[PDB]
C-alpha cells in the first residue's frame, strides 16, 4: 500500500545529513518492504542514484528514532531539472526526547528496575520502529 513506483526513470539524489545523528536511509521497495542503505555520519553528505517515484524515509541508525526529510516524513525523488534531501532533527515532544535519553542509558532488561509509573515502563520498551510507523 505504501510502495515505491517502478518507473525506471533515473533521479540523482543528494543525502544531506544536517543532524547530530548517524542517519540510516530506508528505501521502501516495490512490495513495501523497508530496505536499509549505508549509513551517513553526522554533518556529512552522500550522492546516490535513485529513481522517480521511489519512497525514502530516514531514521537514527542506532535507535531508529524518527527523522525529517525536507520538513516531512517521506522523501520522493522528482524530475531533475540533483534533488536535495535535507535530513534534520524534528522537534520531539519532551516526553519522547526523555525516552530517547533513558533508553540510551539503561539496558532494556533494567527498564523494570527503574522507579516509575508502570505506564512509563511500557512506553520505554515501545521502541521507535520502521514497521510500526509504517501504516498510513
Amino acid at each position: 500500500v505504501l510502495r515505491s513506483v517502478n518507473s525506471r526513470e533515473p533521479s540523482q539524489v543528494i543525502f544531506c545529513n544536517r543532524s547530530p545523528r548517524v542517519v540510516l536511509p530506508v528505501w521502501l521497495n516495490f512490495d513495501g518492504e523497508p530496505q536499509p542503505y549505508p549509513t551517513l555520519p553526522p554533518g556529512t553528505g552522500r550522492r546516490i542514484h535513485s529513481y522517480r517515484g521511489h519512497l525514502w524515509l530516514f531514521r537514527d541508525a542506532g535507535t531508529h528514532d524518527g527523522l525529517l526529510v525536507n520538513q516531512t516524513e517521506l522523501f520522493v525523488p522528482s524530475l531533475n531539472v540533483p534533488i536535495f534531501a535535507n535530513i534534520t532533527l524534528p522537534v520531539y515532544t519532551l516526553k519522547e526526547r526523555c525516552l530517547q535519553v533513558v533508553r540510551s542509558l539503561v539496558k532494556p532488561e533494567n527498564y523494570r528496575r527503574l522507579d516509575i509509573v508502570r505506564s512509563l515502563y511500557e512506553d520505554l520498551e515501545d521502541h521507535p520502529n520502521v514497521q510500526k510507523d509504517l501504516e498510513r
Binding site: 539503561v106 533494567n110 527503574l114 522507579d115
Partner: protein, 102 residues
Amino acid sequence: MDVFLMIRRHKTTIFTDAKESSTVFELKRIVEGILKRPPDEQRLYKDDQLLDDGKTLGECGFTSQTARPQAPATVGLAFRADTFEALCIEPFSSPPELPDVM
C-alpha cells in the same frame, strides 16, 4: 538577532528573549512590566559584573549563539529597598544520585 535569557533573583526566574542590539535599560523595562519595579530600582549583572544601562546585550556578551533557547544565558537581578541589596541567586534543587542502572 534574538538572545534567550534567564533573569534571576533569589527564587525568581524570568524566561524571556531580546535583540542583541537592545540595551540593558530596555531589558530593565521588560523586568518592570513583569515585576512592577522601575529600572532605577533595578541592577542587572552578568555573573558578578554590574551592567551599564547604555550598553547593548551583545556588548555584554549575550550573543545569539550562546544565549540559546534550549540553554538561555543568566542575567543577575538585584532590587533596591534606599540602598541596593546584594546580588543573590538561589541555586536550583540538586538532582538525585544517578541510579545504579544508569
